[PDB]
Amino acid sequence: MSSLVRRIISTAKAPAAIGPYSQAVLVDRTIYISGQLGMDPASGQLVPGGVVEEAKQALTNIGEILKAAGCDFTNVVKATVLLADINDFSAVNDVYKQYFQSSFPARDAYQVAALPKGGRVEIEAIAVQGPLTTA
Amino acid sequence: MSSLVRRIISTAKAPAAIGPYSQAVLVDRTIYISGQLGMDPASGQLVPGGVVEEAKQALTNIGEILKAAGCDFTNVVKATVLLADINDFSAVNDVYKQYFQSSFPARDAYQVAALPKGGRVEIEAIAVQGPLTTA
Amino acid sequence: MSSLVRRIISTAKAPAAIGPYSQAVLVDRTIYISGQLGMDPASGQLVPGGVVEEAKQALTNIGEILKAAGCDFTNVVKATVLLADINDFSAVNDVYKQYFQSSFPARDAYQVAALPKGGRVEIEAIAVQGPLTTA
């Protein structure tokens, strides 16, 4: 019956909420990060250039939320890649892989019917606050 | 190598299962709640009135499952809103927000191809059993 | 500020990765398992026979990943069943139920627009390493 830490993670380096959600919630040591679109943090608008540019921006936004929680991409344990078009799998994979210098997280990836704002990709993530042990 | 608590959460105040799943599982302090449709608990039928009425019922059902586990909406840390139609985002958001009097959970929301029973909305949730600390 | 265990789970009894992900990640006591298609572990090809055969293979693959982490299906706490066609719900349920001899996990199940490789079903899972307590 200990009181576990629960903290809302919020940074102006990631887009403002455009509905009733927080950017991320840290609870105990697990960080649940809200799905990120390829939105520019300053404007809230999707960046032009289609799925590859959107994917880069979405991952940049996750990176800023991780940083706010004292983490980096090495703390991610599970991610989800939602696509508007399954044909973009290869292209998104090549972007995604550049954000992990070490062992990849668990992952799910597939096509949904529609994302908010007509996005072409959304990235969701679960991280665990460090320190974490090595193999 | 402690033995962690794992408990099936079951209440007659939420719909009966219509396949091989439990309403929720508590494991350690985390509660994984099965996605709820706008089903009436007594009948198992979707409530009439479309997405807004379904969303209200789905959230009521989650509330009853949280209550069974000694929790309320303040214990939710992450939710997922699956829509049959992305155009219902605004309407569902206005329903959803009424269930959180405090800081919102992390969230994902988007359109899938089809839900069981022709539902227009499904709400999934992860909660952590209290006590939880405040900011 | 303890260092929590984080381990990549990898077994040749499940399919090789065909992108930048691990089969599963164990972190503390929670195991996040990447979504499994009905892929033959030796070939990486989808097994013939459609959704029922694919579902059996996907669940077999999850079973091998659980075994690698010292677990079995009784350790699963939450699963997700993604379908290419909602009409396959009954058939997939009858396969799925055969993998749980005890109380079912929490679950989500619904239709997405498309899965990798034209799969008809994907199964995702979260498990917790034992020992777990009984009711």
UniProtKB/Swiss-Prot annotation, chains A, B, C:
UniProt gene name: RIDA
Gene Ontology terms: biological process: lipid metabolic process; mRNA catabolic process; mRNA destabilization; negative regulation of translation
Modified residues (Phosphothreonine): 74
Disulphide bonds in the chain: none
Similarity annotation: Belongs to the RutC family.
Keyword Chaperone among record annotations: no
Tissue specificity statement from the Swiss-Prot or TrEMBL entry: Expressed by various malignant neoplasms.
EC number(s) given by UniProt: 3.5.99.10, 3.1.-.-
Modified residues (N-acetylserine): 2
This protein's name: 2-iminobutanoate/2-iminopropanoate deaminase
Keyword hit for Lipid metabolism: yes
Pfam families (UniProt xref): Ribonuc_L-PSP
Organism: Capra hircus (Goat)
